[PDB]
Design a protein around this ligand. Structure first.
Ligand code: N4R
Ligand code: CL
Ligand code: CL
Ligand code: K
Ligand code: K
Ligand code: K
Ligand code: K
Ligand code: K
Ligand code: ZN
Length: 756
């Protein structure tokens, strides 16, 4: 309703104070000033620094420190300011892996303050997110002691400060640093207002600080029981897939259930390739994906503070990759496979199992065994130049000329598109988009999927008299035709081709297609369910045509009906992946086929490249559509590695639909579009299929375009609990597809057999 006031813009805190302290006894200490100065050099070299709002650093106050620390500790730390090298060494010796400096106090104060300054701007809707390039780090510091190069616990102090001075209820702290932030774990052990997550290297205590508490078994005590999550890696050399799958199957479900009003990140880059202490092999590009994922929960309220990362290049690279996500730039192509390794899956599963009682979101999994067979190939896509994102928009009023001369009360109304378009202009989304001109799809182009018999039969209709047009329409299941119905289905496909062209030639990064008549029901030789040509399927082959025959295309169908037309066109094709969320009702719901079931996994060389998530018994909404994305849609999509993502966007699955009978809010469609934007380097094309409530479609589709333009994900309702008829529908797809995609394999025991 107001856009000049909208909070956009990333704050960045950096002060020379951060370089003023170092180790006096060891000239080669990993925690040094070059860590932060290098990050700054690169941020400028990349052009990222100038794109950040400059936020001033402030010193932390004694009372702010005392929200987590003791007065005895604070005063001792304060006293270090006026101590001899010797006095400092003697005190430093008293703690695990710590050095001290005359100037260490000053910098540690500014290192805390800097985070609070960002919390201020984010919480008061001034900036959307922020990142401090601060040292000394925080996550290891405890109430009464220094530890692992930390003096004060920056993010712990910030979590409390948020709750106190900004009256924030729930705070999520994500620690992707390669070390376990025990200092944080401790502070919020018994606090259930602060949920703390920590993926770290462990190898059964062999890796520093060698704590028993760093295991997944340690889930927090008292009131805070289940609000402490440890993901310990017990094998080195973890990659992108190992962190993405962890976030998908474990952290995102937990985070969406917990509903925080703020997300704090202990952004350590010691897991990046080339870090001497981490021993991990995560490419920096991965952090672009993780940062994006966290934008969903806490509705954009995201603050990152620098923790570890001891290789000057690797850290600067990691910071840049995270900074790009905050600044709203498109995600990169993943430089490694989207598949996890067995040791990762074992660590993820043992953590899901260790937290199963406390989280209704994790309770989704029934338990038992999912396949461990050699999975399908998990390829990598060629790097695409990260550029200023542009959202394309295509609409032509000529697509309204297709109508029913008999039943004027037919749900596929011409108004559907003009209404969606109106809302796009009212909300000003249209003026923020790049207008792509609609065109007519050629017969050669229609040939890509459809028979010459089916093409000529619909082509001919541009001349038929109305009685011939009533007769012709009864020759099909649910089809109505008119003298313009052919030109309309030609524009619907033509437009979508011009979008995919813009996207692939880098003219735009993503686009939206307000088109009618729909297409996901149309087959090689027959029209069906208001569809003439499979507009999504033809786009996929037009894309494969302008690139290379092998171009991997993902087709996500969120329309309430299963896209029978799509499913069959690519049933044998391994280059195109088709995922469909639909009301099945054991075969009762349209197009009444058993093809829409979880046991149909594609056939031939396309075995595993076809996913169906069938809905039985209930009004499925956001809780069920989201959990399907976390556990199934996103893990499969990621392992497949698409180069183009196509949405068969039907809002007939929305709350208020006459034909759907499902309760998916417009805010829910926003979060589904958001999730999909981390794939294909953000190369997402949104195509209108179903949706029959003029109001519900205009609102829900505008929400998608808002997400494409990089606006913060909206506030959601409650996502736990979900229909027991859905929990069972999900676990069916998991079992059906686990032999093909390693990202699914959450082999957990019989924790289900407990509580009711
Ligand atoms: C035996 C057919 C039952 C399903 N259908 C047709 C249908 C076809 C496609 C879609 C769709 O969502 N297309 O994208 C929805 C319903 C209908 O119920 N359609 C309908 C037609 C006129 C008036 C009221 C309803
Ligand atoms: Cl050991
Ligand atoms: Cl279950
Ligand atoms: K960690
Ligand atoms: K806690
Ligand atoms: K660290
Ligand atoms: K569907
Ligand atoms: K397939
Ligand atoms: Zn539909």
């Amino acid at each position: 309703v107001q856009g000049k006031s909208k909070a956009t813009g990333t704050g960045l805190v950096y002060v020379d104070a951060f370089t003023r302290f170092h180790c006096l006894w060891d000239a080669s200490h990993p925690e040094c000033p070059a860590r932060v100065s290098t990050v700054m050099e690169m941020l400028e070299t990349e052009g990222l620094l100038g794109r950040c709002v400059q936020v001033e650093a402030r010193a932390v106050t004694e009372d702010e420190l005392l929200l987590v620390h003791t007065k005895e500790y604070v005063e001792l730390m304060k006293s270090t300011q006026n101590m001899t090298e010797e006095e400092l060494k003697t005190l430093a010796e008293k703690y695990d892996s710590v050095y001290l400096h005359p100037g260490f106090f000053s910098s540690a104060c500014l290192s805390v303050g800097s985070v609070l300054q960002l919390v201020d701007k984010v919480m008061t809707s001034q900036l959307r997110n922020g990142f401090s390039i601060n040292r000394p780090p925080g996550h290891h510091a405890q109430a009464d002691k220094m530890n692992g190069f930390c003096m004060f616990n920056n993010l712990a102090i910030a979590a409390r400060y948020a709750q106190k001075r900004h009256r924030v209820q729930r705070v999520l702290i994500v620690d992707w640093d390669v070390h376990h932030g025990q200092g944080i774990q401790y502070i919020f052990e018994e606090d259930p207002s602060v949920l703390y997550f920590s993926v770290h290297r462990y190898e059964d205590g062999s890796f520093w600080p060698h704590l028993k508490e760093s295991d997944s078994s340690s889930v927090g005590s008292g009131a805070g029981q289940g609000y402490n999550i440890n993901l310990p890696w017990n094998k080195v050399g973890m990659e992108s897939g190992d962190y993405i799958t962890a976030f998908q199957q474990l952290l995102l479900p937990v985070a969406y259930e917990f509903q925080p009003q703020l997300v704090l990140v202990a952004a350590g880059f010691d897991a990046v390739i080339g870090d001497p202490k981490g021993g991990m092999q995560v490419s920096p590009e991965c952090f672009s994906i993780l940062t994006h994922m966290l934008k969903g929960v806490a509705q954009g309220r995201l603050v990152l503070a620098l923790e570890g990362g001891y290789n000057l290049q690797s850290t600067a690279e990691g910071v840049c990759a995270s900074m790009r996500s905050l600044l709203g730039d498109p995600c990169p192509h993943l430089p490694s496979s989207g598949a996890p390794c067995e040791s990762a899956l074992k660590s993820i599963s043992k953590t899901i199992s260790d937290l199963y009682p406390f989280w209704k979101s994790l309770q989704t999994f029934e338990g038992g065994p999912l396949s461990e067979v050699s999975p399908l190939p998990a390829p990598v896509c060629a790097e695409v130049k990260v550029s200023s994102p542009i959202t394309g928009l295509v609409y032509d009023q000529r697509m309204m000329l297709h109508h029913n001369m008999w039943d004027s009360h037919h749900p596929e109304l011409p108004q559907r598109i003009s209404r969606i378009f109106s809302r796009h202009e009212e909300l000003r989304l249209l003026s923020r988009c790049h207008r792509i001109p609609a065109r007519l799809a050629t017969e050669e182009e229609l040939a890509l999927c459809h028979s010459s018999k089916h093409i000529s039969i619909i082509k001919s209709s541009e001349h038929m008299k109305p009685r011939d047009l009533n007769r012709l329409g009864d020759e099909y299941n649910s089809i109505f035709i008119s003298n313009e119905s052919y030109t309309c289905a030609l524009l619907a496909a033509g437009s979508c081709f011009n979008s995919a062209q813009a996207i692939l030639t880098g003219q735009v990064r993503n686009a939206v297609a307000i088109v009618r008549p729909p297409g996901h029901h149309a087959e090689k030789d027959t029209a069906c369910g208001f569809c003439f040509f499979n507009t999504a399927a033809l786009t996929a082959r037009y894309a494969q045509s302008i690139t290379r025959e092998s171009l991997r295309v993902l087709i996500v169908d969120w329309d309430v009906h299963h896209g029978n037309g799509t499913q069959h066109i690519f049933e044998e094709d391994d280059s195109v992946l088709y995922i469909s969320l639909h009301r099945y009702e054991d075969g009762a719901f349209f197009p009444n086929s058993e093809d829409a079931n979880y046991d149909k996994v594609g056939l031939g060389k396309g075995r595993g490249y076809n996913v169906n998530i069938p809905w039985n018994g209930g009004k499925m909404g956001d809780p069920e559509y989201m959990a399907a994305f976390h556990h199934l849609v996103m893990p499969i999509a990621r392992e497949f590695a698409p180069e183009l993502v196509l949405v068969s966007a039907g809002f007939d699955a929305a709350r208020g639909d006459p034909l759907g009978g499902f309760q998916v809010t417009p805010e829910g469609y926003a979060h589904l579009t958001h999730q999909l934007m981390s794939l294909a380097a953000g190369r997402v094309l949104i195509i209108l299929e179903g949706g029959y409530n003029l109001t519900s479609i205009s609102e829900s589709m505008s929400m998608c375009t808002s997400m494409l333009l990089g606006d913060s994900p909206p506030s959601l309702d409650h996502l736990t609990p979900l229909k027991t008829s859905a929990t069972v529908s999900i676990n069916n797809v998991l079992r059906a597809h686990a032999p093909f995609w390693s990202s699914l394999r959450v082999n957990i025991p019989e924790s289900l057999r407990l509580s009711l």
